[PDB]
């Protein structure tokens, strides 16, 4: 619900969504193993009615030389749901300063609701 700081699971994405990396959390908030959905994409867990503009974050990641989704809402590992906002981040590479991997924060504003 409304507040609550340990309340966070952090992510790294591929520029093309895909999960490298997930914090433990996940499978408290969500039930996912990071690892189960490293391999995999975000927007297969995401809302579908709210997918589309999720997508469009990702699309724009450049209004703050970074961008931040709404509170959305995830599947749940076990076929519910749950709430949590995601901001994306790009880290570069320092050599050339490439976009390689996305740090992404994800942190619930609610457990799962199934």
């Given at each position: 619900?409304?507040?609550?700081?340990?309340?966070t699971?952090?992510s790294?994405?591929?520029?093309?969504?895909?999960?490298t990396?997930?914090?433990?959390?996940?499978?408290?908030?969500?039930?996912?193993?990071p690892?189960?959905?490293?391999?995999r994409?975000a927007?297969?867990?995401?809302?579908?009615?709210?997918?589309?503009?999720?997508?469009?974050?990702?699309?724009?990641?450049?209004?703050?030389?970074?961008?931040?989704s709404?509170?959305?809402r995830?599947?749940?590992?076990?076929?519910?749901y749950?709430?949590?906002?995601?901001?994306?981040?790009?880290?570069?590479?320092?050599?050339?300063?490439?976009?390689?991997?996305?740090?992404?924060?994800?942190?619930?504003?609610?457990?799962?609701?199934?």
């Amino acid at each position: 619900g409304e507040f609550l700081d340990s309340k966070t699971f952090l992510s790294r994405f591929s520029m093309d969504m895909k999960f490298t990396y997930c914090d433990d959390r996940i499978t408290e908030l969500i039930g996912y193993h990071p690892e189960e959905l490293l391999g995999r994409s975000a927007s297969e867990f995401w809302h579908a009615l709210d997918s589309e503009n999720m997508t469009k974050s990702h699309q724009n990641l450049c209004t703050k030389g970074q961008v931040v989704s709404g509170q959305y809402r995830m599947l749940a590992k076990h076929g519910g749901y749950v709430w949590l906002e995601t901001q994306m981040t790009v880290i570069y590479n320092p050599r050339n300063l490439q976009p390689q991997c996305i740090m992404a924060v994800n942190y619930v504003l609610s457990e799962i609701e199934k």
